[PDB]
Tab-separated table of N, CA, C and O in Angstrom:
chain	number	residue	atom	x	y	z
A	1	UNK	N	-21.735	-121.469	-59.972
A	1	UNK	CA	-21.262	-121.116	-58.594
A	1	UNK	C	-21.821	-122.121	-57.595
A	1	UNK	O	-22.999	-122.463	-57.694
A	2	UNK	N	-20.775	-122.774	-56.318
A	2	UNK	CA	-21.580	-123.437	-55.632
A	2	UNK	C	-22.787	-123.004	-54.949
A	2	UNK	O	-23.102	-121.814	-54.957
A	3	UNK	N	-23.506	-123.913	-54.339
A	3	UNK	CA	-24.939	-123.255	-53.908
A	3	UNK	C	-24.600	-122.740	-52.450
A	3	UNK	O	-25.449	-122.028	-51.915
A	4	UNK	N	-23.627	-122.985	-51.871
A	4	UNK	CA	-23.048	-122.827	-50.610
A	4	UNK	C	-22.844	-120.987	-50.343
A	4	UNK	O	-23.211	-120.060	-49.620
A	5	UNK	N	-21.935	-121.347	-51.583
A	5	UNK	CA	-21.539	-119.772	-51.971
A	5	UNK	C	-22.559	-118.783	-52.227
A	5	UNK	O	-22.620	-117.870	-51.403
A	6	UNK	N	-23.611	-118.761	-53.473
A	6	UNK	CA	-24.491	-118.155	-53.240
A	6	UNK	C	-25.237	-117.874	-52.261
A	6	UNK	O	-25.732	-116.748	-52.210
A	7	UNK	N	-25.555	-119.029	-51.029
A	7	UNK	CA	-26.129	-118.616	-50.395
A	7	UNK	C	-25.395	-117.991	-49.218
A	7	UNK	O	-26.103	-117.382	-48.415
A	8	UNK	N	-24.083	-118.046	-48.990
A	8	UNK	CA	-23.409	-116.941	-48.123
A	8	UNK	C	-23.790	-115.694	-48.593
A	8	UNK	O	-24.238	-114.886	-47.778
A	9	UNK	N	-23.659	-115.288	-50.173
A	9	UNK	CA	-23.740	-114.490	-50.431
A	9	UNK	C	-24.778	-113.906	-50.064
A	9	UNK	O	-24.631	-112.918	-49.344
A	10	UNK	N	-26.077	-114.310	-50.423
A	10	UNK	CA	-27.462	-113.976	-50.042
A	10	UNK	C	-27.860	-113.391	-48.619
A	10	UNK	O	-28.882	-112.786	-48.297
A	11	UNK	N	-26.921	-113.696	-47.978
A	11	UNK	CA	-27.099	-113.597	-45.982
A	11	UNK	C	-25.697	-112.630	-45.514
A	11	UNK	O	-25.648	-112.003	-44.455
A	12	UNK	N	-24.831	-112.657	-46.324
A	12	UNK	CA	-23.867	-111.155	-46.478
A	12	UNK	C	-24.832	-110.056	-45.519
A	12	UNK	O	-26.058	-109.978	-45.596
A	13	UNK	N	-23.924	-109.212	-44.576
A	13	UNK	CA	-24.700	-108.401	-43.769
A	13	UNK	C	-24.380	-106.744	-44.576
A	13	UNK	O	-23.334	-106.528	-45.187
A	14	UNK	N	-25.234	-105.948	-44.456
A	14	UNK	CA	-25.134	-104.607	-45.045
A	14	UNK	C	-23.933	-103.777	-43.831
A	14	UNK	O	-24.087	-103.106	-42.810
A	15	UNK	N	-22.936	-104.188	-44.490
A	15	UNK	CA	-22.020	-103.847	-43.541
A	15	UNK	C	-20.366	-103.643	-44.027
A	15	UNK	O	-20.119	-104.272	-45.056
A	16	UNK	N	-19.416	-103.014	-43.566
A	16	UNK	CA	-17.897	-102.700	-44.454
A	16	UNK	C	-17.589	-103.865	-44.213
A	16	UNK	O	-18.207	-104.426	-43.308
A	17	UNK	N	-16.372	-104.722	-45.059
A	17	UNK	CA	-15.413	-105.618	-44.669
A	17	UNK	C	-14.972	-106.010	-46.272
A	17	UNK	O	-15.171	-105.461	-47.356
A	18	UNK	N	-14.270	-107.246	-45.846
A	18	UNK	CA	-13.557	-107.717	-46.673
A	18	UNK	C	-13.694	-109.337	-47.289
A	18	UNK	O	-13.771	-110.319	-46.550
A	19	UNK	N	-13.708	-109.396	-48.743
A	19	UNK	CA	-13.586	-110.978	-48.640
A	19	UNK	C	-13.058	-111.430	-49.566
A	19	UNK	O	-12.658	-110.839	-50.569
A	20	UNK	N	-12.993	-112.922	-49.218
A	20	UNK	CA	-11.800	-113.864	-49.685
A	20	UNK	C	-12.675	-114.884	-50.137
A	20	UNK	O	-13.403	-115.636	-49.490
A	21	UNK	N	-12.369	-114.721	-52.079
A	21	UNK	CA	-12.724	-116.436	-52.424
A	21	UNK	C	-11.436	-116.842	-52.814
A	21	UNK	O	-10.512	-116.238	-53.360
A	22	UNK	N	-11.673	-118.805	-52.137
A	22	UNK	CA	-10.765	-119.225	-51.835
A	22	UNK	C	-11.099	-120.803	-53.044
A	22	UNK	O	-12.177	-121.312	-53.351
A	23	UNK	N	-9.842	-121.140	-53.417
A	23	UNK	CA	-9.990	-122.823	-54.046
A	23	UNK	C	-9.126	-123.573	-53.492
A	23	UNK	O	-7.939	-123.286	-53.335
A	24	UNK	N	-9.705	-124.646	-53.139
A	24	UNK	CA	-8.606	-125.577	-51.683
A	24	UNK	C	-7.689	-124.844	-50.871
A	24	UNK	O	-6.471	-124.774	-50.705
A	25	UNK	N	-8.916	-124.235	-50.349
A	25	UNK	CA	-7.922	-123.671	-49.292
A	25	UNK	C	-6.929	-122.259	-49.659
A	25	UNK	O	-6.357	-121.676	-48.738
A	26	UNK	N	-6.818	-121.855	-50.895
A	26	UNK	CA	-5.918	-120.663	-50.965
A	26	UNK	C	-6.756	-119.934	-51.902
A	26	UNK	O	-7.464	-120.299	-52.840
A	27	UNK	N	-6.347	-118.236	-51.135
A	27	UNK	CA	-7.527	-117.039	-52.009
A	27	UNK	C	-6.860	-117.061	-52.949
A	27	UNK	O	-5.644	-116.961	-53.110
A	28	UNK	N	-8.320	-117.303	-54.109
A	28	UNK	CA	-8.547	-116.253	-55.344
A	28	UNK	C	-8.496	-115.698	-56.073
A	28	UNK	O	-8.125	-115.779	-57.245
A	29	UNK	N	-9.281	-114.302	-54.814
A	29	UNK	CA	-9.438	-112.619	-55.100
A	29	UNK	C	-9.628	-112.608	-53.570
A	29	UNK	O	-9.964	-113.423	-52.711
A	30	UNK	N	-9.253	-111.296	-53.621
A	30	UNK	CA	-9.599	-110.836	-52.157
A	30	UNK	C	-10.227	-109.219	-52.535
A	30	UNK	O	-9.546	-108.353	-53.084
A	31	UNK	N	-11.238	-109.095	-52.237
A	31	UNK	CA	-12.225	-107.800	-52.585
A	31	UNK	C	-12.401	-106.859	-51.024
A	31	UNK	O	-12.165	-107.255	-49.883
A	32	UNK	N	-12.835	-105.679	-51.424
A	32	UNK	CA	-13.691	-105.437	-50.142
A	32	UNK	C	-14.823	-103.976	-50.632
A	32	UNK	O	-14.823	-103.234	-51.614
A	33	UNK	N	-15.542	-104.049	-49.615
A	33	UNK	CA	-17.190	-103.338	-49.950
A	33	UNK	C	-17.511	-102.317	-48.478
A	33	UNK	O	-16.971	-102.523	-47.392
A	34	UNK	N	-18.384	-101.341	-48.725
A	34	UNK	CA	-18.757	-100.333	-48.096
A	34	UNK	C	-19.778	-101.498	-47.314
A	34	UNK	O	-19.776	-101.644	-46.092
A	35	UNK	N	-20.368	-102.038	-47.954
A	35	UNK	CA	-21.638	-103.359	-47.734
A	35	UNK	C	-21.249	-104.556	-48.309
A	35	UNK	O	-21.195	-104.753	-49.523
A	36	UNK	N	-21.025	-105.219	-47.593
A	36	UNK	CA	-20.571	-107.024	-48.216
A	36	UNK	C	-21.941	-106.890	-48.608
A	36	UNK	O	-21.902	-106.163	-49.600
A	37	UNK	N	-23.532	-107.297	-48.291
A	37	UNK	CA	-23.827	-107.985	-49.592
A	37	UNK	C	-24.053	-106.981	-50.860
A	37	UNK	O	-24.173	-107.474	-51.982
A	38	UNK	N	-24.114	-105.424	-50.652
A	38	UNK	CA	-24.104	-105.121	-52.229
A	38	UNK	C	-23.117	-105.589	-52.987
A	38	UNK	O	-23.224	-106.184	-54.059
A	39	UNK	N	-22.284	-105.343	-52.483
A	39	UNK	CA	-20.825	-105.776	-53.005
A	39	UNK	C	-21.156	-107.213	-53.838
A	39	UNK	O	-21.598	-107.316	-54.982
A	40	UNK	N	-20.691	-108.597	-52.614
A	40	UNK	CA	-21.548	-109.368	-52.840
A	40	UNK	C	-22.206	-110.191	-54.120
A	40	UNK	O	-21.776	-111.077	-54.858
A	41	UNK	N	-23.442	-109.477	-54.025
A	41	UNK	CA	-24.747	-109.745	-54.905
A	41	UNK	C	-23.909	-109.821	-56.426
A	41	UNK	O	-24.001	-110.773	-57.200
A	42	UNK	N	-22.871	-108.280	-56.714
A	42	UNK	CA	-22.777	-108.189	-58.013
A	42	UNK	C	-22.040	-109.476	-58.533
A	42	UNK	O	-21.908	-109.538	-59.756
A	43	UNK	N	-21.538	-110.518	-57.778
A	43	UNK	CA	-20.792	-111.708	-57.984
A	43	UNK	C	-22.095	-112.590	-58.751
A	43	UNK	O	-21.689	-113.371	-59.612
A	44	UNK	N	-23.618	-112.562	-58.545
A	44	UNK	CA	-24.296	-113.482	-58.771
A	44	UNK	C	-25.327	-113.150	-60.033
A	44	UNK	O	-26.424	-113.674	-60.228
A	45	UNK	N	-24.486	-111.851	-61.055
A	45	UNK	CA	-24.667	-111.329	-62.252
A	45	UNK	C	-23.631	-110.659	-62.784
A	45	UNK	O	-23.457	-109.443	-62.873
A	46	UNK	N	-22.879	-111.665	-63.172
A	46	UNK	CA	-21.404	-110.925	-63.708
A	46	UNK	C	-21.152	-110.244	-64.914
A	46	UNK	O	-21.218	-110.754	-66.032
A	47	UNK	N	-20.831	-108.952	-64.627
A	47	UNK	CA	-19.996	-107.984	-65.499
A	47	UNK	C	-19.034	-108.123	-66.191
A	47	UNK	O	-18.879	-107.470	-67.223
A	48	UNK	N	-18.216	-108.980	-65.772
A	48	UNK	CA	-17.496	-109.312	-66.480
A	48	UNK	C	-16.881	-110.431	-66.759
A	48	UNK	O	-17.484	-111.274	-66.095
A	49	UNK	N	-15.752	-111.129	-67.543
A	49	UNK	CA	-15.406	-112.301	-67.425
A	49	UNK	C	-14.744	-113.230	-66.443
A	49	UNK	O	-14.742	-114.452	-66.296
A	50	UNK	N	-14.024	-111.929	-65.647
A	50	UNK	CA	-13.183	-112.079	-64.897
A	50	UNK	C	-13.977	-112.322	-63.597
A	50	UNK	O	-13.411	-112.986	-62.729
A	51	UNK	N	-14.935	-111.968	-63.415
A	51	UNK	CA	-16.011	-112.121	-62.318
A	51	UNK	C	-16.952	-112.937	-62.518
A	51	UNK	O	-17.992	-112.977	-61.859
A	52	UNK	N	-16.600	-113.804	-63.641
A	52	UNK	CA	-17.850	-115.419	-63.735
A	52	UNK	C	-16.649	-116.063	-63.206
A	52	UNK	O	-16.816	-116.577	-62.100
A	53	UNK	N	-15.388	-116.174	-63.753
A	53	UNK	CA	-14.759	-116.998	-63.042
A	53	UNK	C	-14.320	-117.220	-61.935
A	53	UNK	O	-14.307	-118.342	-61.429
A	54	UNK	N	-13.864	-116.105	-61.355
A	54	UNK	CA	-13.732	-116.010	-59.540
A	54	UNK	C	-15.084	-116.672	-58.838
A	54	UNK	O	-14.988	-117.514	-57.946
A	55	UNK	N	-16.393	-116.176	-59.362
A	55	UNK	CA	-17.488	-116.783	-59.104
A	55	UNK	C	-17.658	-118.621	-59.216
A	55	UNK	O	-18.282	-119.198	-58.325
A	56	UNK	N	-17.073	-119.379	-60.327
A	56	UNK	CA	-16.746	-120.706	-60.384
A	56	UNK	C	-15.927	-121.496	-60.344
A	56	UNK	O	-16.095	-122.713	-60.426
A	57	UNK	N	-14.548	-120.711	-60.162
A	57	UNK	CA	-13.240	-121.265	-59.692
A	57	UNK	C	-13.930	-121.416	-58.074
A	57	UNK	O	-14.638	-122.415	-57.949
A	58	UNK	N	-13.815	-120.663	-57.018
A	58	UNK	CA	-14.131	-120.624	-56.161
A	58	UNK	C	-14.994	-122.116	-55.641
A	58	UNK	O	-15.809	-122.765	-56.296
A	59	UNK	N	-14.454	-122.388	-54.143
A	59	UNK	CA	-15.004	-123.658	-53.916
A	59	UNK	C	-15.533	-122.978	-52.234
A	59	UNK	O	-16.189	-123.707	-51.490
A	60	UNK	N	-15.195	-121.707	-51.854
A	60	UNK	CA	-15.268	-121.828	-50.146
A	60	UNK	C	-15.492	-119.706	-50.510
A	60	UNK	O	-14.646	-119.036	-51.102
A	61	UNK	N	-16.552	-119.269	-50.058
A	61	UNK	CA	-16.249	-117.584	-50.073
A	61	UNK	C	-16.149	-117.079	-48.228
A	61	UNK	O	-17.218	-117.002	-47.622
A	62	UNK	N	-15.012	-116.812	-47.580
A	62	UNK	CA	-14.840	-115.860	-46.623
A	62	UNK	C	-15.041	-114.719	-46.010
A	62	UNK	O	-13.985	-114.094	-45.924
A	63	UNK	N	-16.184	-114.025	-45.421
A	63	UNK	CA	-15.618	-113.010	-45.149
A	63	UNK	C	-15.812	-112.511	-44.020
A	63	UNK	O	-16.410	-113.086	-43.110
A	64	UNK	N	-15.345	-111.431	-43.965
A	64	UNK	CA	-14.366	-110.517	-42.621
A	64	UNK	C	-15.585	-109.151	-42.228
A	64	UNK	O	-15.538	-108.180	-42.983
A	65	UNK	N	-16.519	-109.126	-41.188
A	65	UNK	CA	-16.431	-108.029	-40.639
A	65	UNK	C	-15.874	-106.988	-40.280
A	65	UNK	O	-15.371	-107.032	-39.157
A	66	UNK	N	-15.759	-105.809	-40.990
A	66	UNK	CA	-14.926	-104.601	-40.212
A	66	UNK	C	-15.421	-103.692	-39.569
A	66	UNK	O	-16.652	-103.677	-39.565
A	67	UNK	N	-14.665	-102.552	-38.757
A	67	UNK	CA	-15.139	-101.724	-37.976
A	67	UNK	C	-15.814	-100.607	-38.698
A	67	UNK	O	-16.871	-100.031	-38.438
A	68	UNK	N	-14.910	-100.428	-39.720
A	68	UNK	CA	-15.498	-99.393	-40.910
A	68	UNK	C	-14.425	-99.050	-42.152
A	68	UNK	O	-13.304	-99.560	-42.172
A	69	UNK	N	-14.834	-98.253	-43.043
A	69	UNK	CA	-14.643	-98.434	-44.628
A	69	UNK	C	-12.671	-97.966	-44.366
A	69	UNK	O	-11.810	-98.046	-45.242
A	70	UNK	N	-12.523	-97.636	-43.319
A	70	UNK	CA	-10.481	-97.119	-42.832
A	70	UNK	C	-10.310	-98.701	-43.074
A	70	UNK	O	-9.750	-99.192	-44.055
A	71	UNK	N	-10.928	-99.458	-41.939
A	71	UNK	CA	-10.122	-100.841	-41.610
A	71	UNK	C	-10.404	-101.510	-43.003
A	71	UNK	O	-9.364	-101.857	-43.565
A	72	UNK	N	-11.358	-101.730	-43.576
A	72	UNK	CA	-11.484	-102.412	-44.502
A	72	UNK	C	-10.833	-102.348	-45.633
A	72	UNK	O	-10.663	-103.302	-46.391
A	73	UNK	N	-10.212	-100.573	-45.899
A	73	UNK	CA	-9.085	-99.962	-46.712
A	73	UNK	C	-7.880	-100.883	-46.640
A	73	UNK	O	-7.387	-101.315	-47.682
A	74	UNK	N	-7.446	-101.164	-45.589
A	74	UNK	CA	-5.768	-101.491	-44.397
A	74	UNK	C	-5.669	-103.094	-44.675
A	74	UNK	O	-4.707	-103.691	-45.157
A	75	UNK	N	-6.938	-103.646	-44.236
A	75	UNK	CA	-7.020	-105.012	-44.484
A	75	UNK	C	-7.064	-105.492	-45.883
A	75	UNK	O	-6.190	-106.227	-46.344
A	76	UNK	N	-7.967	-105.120	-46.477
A	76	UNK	CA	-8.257	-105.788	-48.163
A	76	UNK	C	-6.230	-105.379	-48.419
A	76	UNK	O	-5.521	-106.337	-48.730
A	77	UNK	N	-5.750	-104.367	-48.295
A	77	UNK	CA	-4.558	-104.267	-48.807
A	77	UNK	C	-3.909	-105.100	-48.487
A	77	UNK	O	-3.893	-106.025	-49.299
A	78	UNK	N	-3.211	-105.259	-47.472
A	78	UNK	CA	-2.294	-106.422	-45.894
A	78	UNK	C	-2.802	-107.482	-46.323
A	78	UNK	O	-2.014	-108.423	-46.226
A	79	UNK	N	-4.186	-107.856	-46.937
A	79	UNK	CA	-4.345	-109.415	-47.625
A	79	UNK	C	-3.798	-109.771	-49.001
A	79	UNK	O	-3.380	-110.807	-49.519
A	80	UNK	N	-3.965	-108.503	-49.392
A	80	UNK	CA	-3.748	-109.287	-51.103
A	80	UNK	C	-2.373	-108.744	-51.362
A	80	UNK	O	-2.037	-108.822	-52.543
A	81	UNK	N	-1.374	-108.136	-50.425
A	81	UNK	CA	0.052	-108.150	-50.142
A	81	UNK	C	0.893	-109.590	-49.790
A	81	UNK	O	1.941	-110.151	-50.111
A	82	UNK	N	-0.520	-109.840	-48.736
A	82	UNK	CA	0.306	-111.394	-48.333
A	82	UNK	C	-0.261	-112.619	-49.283
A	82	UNK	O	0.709	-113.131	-49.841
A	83	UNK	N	-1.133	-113.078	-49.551
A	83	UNK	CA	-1.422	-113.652	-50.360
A	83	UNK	C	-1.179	-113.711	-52.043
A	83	UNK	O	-1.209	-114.720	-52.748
A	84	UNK	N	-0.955	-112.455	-52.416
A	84	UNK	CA	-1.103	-111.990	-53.628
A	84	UNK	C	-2.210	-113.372	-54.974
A	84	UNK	O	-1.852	-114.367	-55.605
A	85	UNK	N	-3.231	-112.817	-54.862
A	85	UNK	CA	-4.319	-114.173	-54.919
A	85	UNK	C	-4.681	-113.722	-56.937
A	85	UNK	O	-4.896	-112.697	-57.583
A	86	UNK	N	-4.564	-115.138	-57.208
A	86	UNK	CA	-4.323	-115.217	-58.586
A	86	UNK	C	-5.308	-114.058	-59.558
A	86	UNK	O	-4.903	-113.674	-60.655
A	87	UNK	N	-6.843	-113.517	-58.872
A	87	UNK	CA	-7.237	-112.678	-59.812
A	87	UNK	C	-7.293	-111.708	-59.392
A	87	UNK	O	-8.098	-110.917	-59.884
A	88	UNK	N	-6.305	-111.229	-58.066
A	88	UNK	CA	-5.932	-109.673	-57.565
A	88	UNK	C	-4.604	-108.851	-58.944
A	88	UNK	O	-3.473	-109.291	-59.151
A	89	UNK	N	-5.199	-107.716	-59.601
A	89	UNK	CA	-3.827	-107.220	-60.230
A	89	UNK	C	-3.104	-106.063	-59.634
A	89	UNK	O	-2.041	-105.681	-60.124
């Protein structure tokens, strides 16, 4: 994983929203969390296979402050509707 990335990750605020890893420029995955960094963190001990690679495909990680766990519901959806991002199923 880049070191960029991890360390967004690391500074992630305990807070709802949404995020977007992106490779040149186009998402991913688009996720979202009660707390970006719990959420987060689990990217930097992966469970699964599918989550080492989003973790090293990835060149840029995004994310979105929300108001709370409604908006973050509305948004994570409305993103990976419009984008439909290669490891969203």
């Amino acid at each position: 994983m880049k070191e960029k990335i991890r360390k967004k990750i690391l500074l992630a605020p305990e807070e709802p929203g949404v995020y977007i890893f992106k490779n040149k420029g186009v998402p991913i995955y688009i996720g979202k969390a009660k707390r970006l960094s719990n959420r987060l963190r689990s990217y930097l001990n992966p469970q699964t296979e599918k989550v080492f690679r989003i973790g090293e495909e990835a060149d840029e990680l995004e994310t979105i402050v929300v108001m709370n766990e409604r908006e973050a519901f509305i948004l994570e959806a409305n993103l990976i509707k419009k984008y439909r991002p290669k490891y969203n199923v």
